[PDB]
Amino acid sequence: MYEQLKGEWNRKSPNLSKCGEELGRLKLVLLELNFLPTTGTKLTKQQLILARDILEIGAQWSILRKDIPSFERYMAQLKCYYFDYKEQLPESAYMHQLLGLNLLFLLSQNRVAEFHTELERLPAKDIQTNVYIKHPVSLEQYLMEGSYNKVFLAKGNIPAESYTFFIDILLDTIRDEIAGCIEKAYEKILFTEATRILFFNTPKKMTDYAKKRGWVLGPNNYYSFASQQQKPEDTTIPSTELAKQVIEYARQ
Amino acid sequence: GIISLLDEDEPQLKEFALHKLNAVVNDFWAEISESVDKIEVLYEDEGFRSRQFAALVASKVFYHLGAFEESLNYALGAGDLFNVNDNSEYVETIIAKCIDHYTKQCVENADLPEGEKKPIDQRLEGIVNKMFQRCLDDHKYKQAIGIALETRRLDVFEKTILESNDVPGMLAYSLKLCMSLMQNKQFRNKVLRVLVKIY
Amino acid sequence: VRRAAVESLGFILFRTPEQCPSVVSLLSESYNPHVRYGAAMALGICCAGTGNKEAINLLEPMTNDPVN
Amino acid sequence: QYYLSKIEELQLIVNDKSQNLRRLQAQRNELNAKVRL
């Protein structure tokens, strides 16, 4: 109970042995009474404080270790614990930055409903101040409006908590998105076209592009394959829907 | 989301997360309605000592979903925790559904009683017996006989007239029910044999 | 078959004399005079000594039907 | 008696649907009698 709150987690915690200490923390201090009521009991308020501290520590550890299950579990625990907003407690500090990182990686997971609903929870937290949390908002805004390389340069810096790996995961989402956008109705894709202008100057990304999707490389050029056809139409699903109408007003 | 607290491989963490689900069931619906996958994971994790109450809160999840029959099945597989409390409206709904199921199964297994019966579940039969037994012992025999006849048990009228015969005109009441109301002889035979053996 | 099936229904439905007039709202007025005759006879059979008050009211128009 | 109430509501639905169902048959029979006349 109330043992080594951040005894070895503030300076540096790179070892895997700290997982056992964190598990013991969960067993003893995190499971003291509860996190739900938070009516009085400033002791339980400090319990919430230590819970959110260990959650941010686990978030940093997970984003540095690249473990999707543990990271997602810590994200969900962070969300459920923060579900209890108490205004008298000192907000900000840990709030805006962590929420920005979480929402940014959630957009990398392709979820916008949670992003916008949290933005509505935060009327002035996102627009007036807290670059810490509007950095993902600006990134999404550019990536929706007009920018790929400008998005890359904007991603070059994170003001929230450094930890410049959410920018790389968004870079993976945007390599996927660019691959889709060029698998779209484009007329032709030169090899230099795919390699130079957008990103990925002759990396293993180039071999991935040449081997995974279609549009086989011609002479220094990928070309669109058979996707638009005259389609001499057998016209059988119109007959089926006509029969559906026939049975629909063949009764009652 | 609290589902992570159940997603952790710590049984004590799972138990902590799943205690207060039965208390937040009334207020929180959407978060519990979306968490069907997590409760399925907990139900599959039968090596953890809270399988029964995990199935109970699974029945609560299906209460949120609206699948009262599936929640009945989950609390059934839980077994003894089907009958945690005998007085609630969700309890009345699930017991009414289970009485309907027992009525249908009894009718079909009496119409084809030469073996090969659909397996009368021990858990379903136990909860059914407890429920109509308490409905008989509540000492309201103007409705005990009615709920018994709805339950459609072959021996239930015999049990009702062998127990406390409150309002001894219940004999004539069930007599007129079997004379006029129950007339489809194929499943009427149970009520008819009890009636002849008593009268 | 039409006249027979509209007349020999009160034998089964006299257990429901209130439903004798409800199941003939089309039979007693049907374009077939034999069907109307069957409906009439069916109510008459299913209500032997019953003051139904509804079968009588529905049969009153048929007491003066143009078909003999 | 609550399942009795549910069955009564189902019976009410059947009666409401049967109202115009019988009326349509009666009036169409009247139309056929009119055209035969």
């Binding site: - | 109301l181 | - | 008696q1 069955i7 189902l10 049967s18 019988r22």
Partner: peptide, 25 residues
């Protein structure tokens, strides 16, 4: 009492609804 009374009444009414509907065609 009223339970099976309404059961039988519903059975007969639901039957007659369909039977009289069969004449719409």
């Amino acid at each position: 009492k009223l339970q099976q009374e309404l059961e039988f009444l519903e059975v007969q009414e639901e039957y007659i609804k369909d039977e009289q509907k069969n004449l719409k065609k």
